[PDB]
Design a protein around this ligand. Sequence first.
Ligand SMILES: Cc1ncc(C[n+]2csc(CCOP(=O)(O)OP(=O)(O)O)c2C)c(N)n1
Ligand SMILES: Cc1ncc(C[n+]2csc(CCOP(=O)(O)OP(=O)(O)O)c2C)c(N)n1
Ligand SMILES: [Cl-]
Ligand SMILES: [Cl-]
Ligand SMILES: [Cl-]
Ligand SMILES: [Cl-]
Ligand SMILES: [Cl-]
Ligand SMILES: [Cl-]
Ligand SMILES: [K+]
Ligand SMILES: [K+]
Ligand SMILES: [K+]
Ligand SMILES: [K+]
Ligand SMILES: [Mn+2]
Ligand SMILES: [Mn+2]
Lengths: 372, 372, 336, 336
Amino acid sequence: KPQFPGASAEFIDKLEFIQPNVISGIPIYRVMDRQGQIINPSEDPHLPKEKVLKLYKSMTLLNTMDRILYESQRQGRISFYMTNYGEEGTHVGSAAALDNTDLVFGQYREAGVLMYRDYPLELFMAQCYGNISDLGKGRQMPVHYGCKERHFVTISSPLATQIPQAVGAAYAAKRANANRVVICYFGEGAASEGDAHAGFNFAATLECPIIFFCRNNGYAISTPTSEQYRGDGIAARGPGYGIMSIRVDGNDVFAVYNATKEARRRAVAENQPFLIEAMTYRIGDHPISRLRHYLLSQGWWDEEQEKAWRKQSRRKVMEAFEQAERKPKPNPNLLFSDVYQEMPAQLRKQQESLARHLQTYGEHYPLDHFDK
Amino acid sequence: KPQFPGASAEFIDKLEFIQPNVISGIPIYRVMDRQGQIINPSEDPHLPKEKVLKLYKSMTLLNTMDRILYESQRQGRISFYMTNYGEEGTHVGSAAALDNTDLVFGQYREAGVLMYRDYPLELFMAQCYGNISDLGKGRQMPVHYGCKERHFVTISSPLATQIPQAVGAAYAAKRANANRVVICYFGEGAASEGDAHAGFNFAATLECPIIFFCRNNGYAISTPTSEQYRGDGIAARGPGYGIMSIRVDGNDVFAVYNATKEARRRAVAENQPFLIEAMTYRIGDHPISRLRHYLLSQGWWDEEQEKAWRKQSRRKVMEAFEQAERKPKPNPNLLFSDVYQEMPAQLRKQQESLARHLQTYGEHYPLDHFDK
Amino acid sequence: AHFTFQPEYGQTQKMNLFQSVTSALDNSLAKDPTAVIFGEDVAFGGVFRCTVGLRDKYGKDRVFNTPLCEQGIVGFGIGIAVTGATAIAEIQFADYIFPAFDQIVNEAAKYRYRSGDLFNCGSLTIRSPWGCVGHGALYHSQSPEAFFAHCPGIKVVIPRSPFQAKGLLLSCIEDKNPCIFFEPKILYRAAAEEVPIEPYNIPLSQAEVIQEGSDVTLVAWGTQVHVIREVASMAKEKLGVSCEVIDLRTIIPWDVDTICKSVIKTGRLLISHEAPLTGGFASEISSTVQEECFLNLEAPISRVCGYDTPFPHIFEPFYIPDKWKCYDALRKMINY
Amino acid sequence: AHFTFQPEYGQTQKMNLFQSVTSALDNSLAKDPTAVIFGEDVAFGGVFRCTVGLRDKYGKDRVFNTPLCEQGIVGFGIGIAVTGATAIAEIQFADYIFPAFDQIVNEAAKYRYRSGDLFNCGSLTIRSPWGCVGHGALYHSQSPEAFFAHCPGIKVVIPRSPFQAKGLLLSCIEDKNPCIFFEPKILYRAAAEEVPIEPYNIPLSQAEVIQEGSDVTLVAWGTQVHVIREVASMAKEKLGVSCEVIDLRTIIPWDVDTICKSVIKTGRLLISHEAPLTGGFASEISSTVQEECFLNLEAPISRVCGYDTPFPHIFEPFYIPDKWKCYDALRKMINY
Ligand SMILES: Cc1ncc(C[n+]2csc(CCOP(=O)(O)OP(=O)(O)O)c2C)c(N)n1
Ligand SMILES: Cc1ncc(C[n+]2csc(CCOP(=O)(O)OP(=O)(O)O)c2C)c(N)n1
Ligand SMILES: [Cl-]
Ligand SMILES: [Cl-]
Ligand SMILES: [Cl-]
Ligand SMILES: [Cl-]
Ligand SMILES: [Cl-]
Ligand SMILES: [Cl-]
Ligand SMILES: [K+]
Ligand SMILES: [K+]
Ligand SMILES: [K+]
Ligand SMILES: [K+]
Ligand SMILES: [Mn+2]
Ligand SMILES: [Mn+2]
């Protein structure tokens, strides 16, 4: 019997290398088939009609917003845009499974979480336009959303940085004795970063109530997964860290919901991390269609409702979009605040330097576009 | 049947989280028991007497050197020292399984690899004393060995940095069409660094002929493994990267040899990485004792040979040690060379500045201790 | 746009800056069979098109994608270089070089020194898009050269044009020291110039005086050279001031002699860079010139730089050290 | 040894610098129930003893070991701080802070700005052993403050004594901005001084004039303050020169006014630091003082720094900017 503190194991008296099982991977959990029918009644969440309709309307409203802002970007009216196509179900389904005060970290594909939490169209647009209504003060590139009121930590461009951060917020929640979970979204590409190894490992050793939600759509920009990793996706990494793990069909809002709800329940009770890997398709057999088929089978929707919602959502998005374009940008003074909490005197000197310069050379600057 | 590019898997219609198996870990491969008897004849490497004696003498000579240099450090004659106690078998056993020209990366516990490759006592000591004989020119802290002739890449203090480097050297070897492998040693603590995730993953996706050799002795300074990770040691991480993995008894030079020899054979033929996790004990049922027992059972050693070797090895080490202490340190001019290949003119100006300063203030500097 | 781009080695052709990088990389691979190119999304031609056609031409083992892991890209590169093979790593934006900061500063830069020259990674070059782009905000705009300037053992090199880019990149790739080559991304598709088809070199650690002048020395690098060239024109027309315009080119080791020789002549210096003032590389130049040229200085050395803030999205037009900010500082220095 | 250490808030006791750090950490945990301390090997008291007794006193959930992963330690800390809890991270040697460089510069420093103050990590402090130690060579000696000085949004703070250490560390821990506190490790066990038992604060961004003088201003930080104090004594005795000795204390944001006010009076400045000259923080001070005090300068500002090399093992006595190197530069400046 082995007496080594690093591992609990028997001896073996023959030489045998352990092989990965990649061809027969961790199976993909699914609740409803492509026609929206529940496959196994015992897995039906029986979510109420109003909630399931909110899932559907959140997804389609996001998709409407995407269409308009994508075109805005192609025209150069905003400088950058990342769509949510194919990811509407992973985000609305997971968000519905959270408590409203569970803290969310993510990056570029998480706008649907905000949509589900009723973030105003006006504020999605304010950030993308960097206008006076943006609580981010116009400082970040478009789609770098955040909302303190809705517990959605501001997105940053460097990939995977939010992973160990999310773990720290989770540790703090544990200590605060919160009945709170943290969820942290990232893509399969981002999981290659050092910071993902840091986060996964810290979460297990420090016993944190965190859900890791990895979106695996087969690509990171032009890079296919064959060039990203050679194990069985990201889900298979979880066990090597001591992390309970599961893989789900990301086109199935119910599969995502069920996995997230159970992960949330156990994470908060046991102070242990959970990893969910949602398989989706690279688009920018759709989560919106599948759920639509379910709605029809229950008698919860029809073509007149679809047409009318399609029209009402376009109007809501176009009102927000028009208002956002017509607002001024913030005061250029806001370029200097929040670097530190307070403004250092030497930084104030730079601000004063800019004000003097604009007094003399202001005709050469777009002053009419900015507030005050 | 699932159609996702990120993973090959079936659907599953019930919610099931995958659990790590940590209590029943990957078993520990062993060839000889604590009395030095071969357990399973089919696993005997039948290494020739001369080779097995070189394994034994390399280990004990290292241990003799350790005793003397450890005491030197306690007295402040050298500034720093890391011993090899408990690691003599992992290093001499693995080294014996390599081709002499296989490139080695490591850090602090790898002196036995150099010892097996016949690195002179004089040069171990020159580095620790930073004397004129040191090919490192006295620039690094003691035990930061390297040897171009013996394909042992110079050690650096930052943990885990050599892991992705080793992978790059392996990729280059593949391209050169070399029949060469790279081996990369690191501890279980160092495996927590981001750079280990980088190395493991790159080695698998880029199909590199590299052996990862992780020494798991249960501790990283004061930190037990319970605070380092929560999966089943390091070996269990391998499969999640698509890396063939095995765990071995680090007190058994034959288990280590057999695993390394087979890993080398397959790595070089298949251009794929292998991970070996050797379980040892934190000492600074010993690899030296166990092998000694094997030698006695073959009639290959006895108490008179042991006493005499014990005496001859002490003499060899004490001759080297005395010579090393009595040599001068290198010319202080060597503080400026090799920063770049060439010496930039502004750096030469600094060198000239020091020479002028020593002309005037030289009495306040230990000039008599340094060459020229 | 805040800048305007302007203007012996055999046959040339019109190339923008990304095409000139591709031409350098192509020449390098043609003549050095050890050389390989790697990083994120380089295989299909790169997100800025700098590697288009190279994988089809030289093979998938020589032009290839890594996992999404900058620390790994740099450590991997170092390892290739340790064997003597030419390793040309790409970091997708300079903003994302920081995960590799430990591999660059603690490893690559110190590799030769700390081994007594038993080992080296001299055949490593790391190339990366750099500098502002009008709308890149905090993480598509950064100019990190001052962070690297404090690390002996690496070279940091930044071109101003397609012709300069190819010649400087070839010299970095062949130099026997780990080099970081920062490619001003706003120039990648902005005006072509004639670039030799065949390989040539421009020397490292050498500034270029692109316009002689007698009243003031202006120093910058990258896109900012074009800003100061315009400033020189504005000073001539509006003030009758003759400006000596210098492209530093190599950040470290830098060409101290060319800059001091200019300031001994003019007696005035203005240094400009997009990077924040505090700790920016203009402070090293200013201090040094003060030390060497103290008796020649007719006026305090001026630094016209980015403010000490992160790089803003909507406020970029107010952030950058543009031609009016440079002109105004130069006016005041001339009036001192 | 290359230096010699020397010399209202209630009851004091004799404390060396590591004990003063422990006293700061203890006061902090006593009065702030959110506060936690973490990093590599902190639980048993730390490799330099700075956390001895704290885990037994405050509990295993408040004083605890992380995995061996600096990028994780810093990212973890940021996350704690995002919730409003005080997070006091340890990086074992400053030489090993670079794996965290991206978390520090791209994340911690920019957290408040980029969110419009919706989120922040102001309750984060990263403490780390710093500076030379006689034999630490490349990776137990480094002084990284200039790398961080180029990053708006972090504060970098370095004390010279046990009394200064506790007061400065308490101010970093309570400051509403992410702070890096560098503890000069050569001082940890070198001479005690009286330190208040109860909490007190020393202000950030304020230099201290520890000796008034009229002929020259000398500026340093950390251990180097003790070197320049000795230089001042040597200049008085051997040259009849009166030196104003200043401890900068905060690297950024730095106390520009106190330094310029001193140089307007003396008309001469010498800045000294262990870190390499090129890109070192002395270049920012020199440039700035030149800009503000041009008419007052009687002689070029002198920088006496580490050479532009990695930090050597056996050659340390020849590397450091010792009292003779400082004295000689000061002699030449006085004779200018
Ligand atoms: C540290 C860093 N490196 C590179 C990038 C550039 N980049 C932006 S998105 C992306 C691909 C992300 O892939 P994945 O994580 O799979 O998310 P997906 O876009 O597939 O949803 C890259 C490389 C970045 N933002 N950060
Ligand atoms: C990046 C970095 N962080 C911290 C250290 C300090 N350190 C030197 S050895 C050590 C523990 C290493 O543990 P392990 O890798 O298990 O090797 P072992 O000493 O057990 O053989 C640490 C934390 C270092 N050298 N590098
Ligand atoms: Cl449209
Ligand atoms: Cl991006
Ligand atoms: Cl204009
Ligand atoms: Cl002894
Ligand atoms: Cl160490
Ligand atoms: Cl003396
Ligand atoms: K991020
Ligand atoms: K190392
Ligand atoms: K090079
Ligand atoms: K703080
Ligand atoms: Mn992806
Ligand atoms: Mn260990």
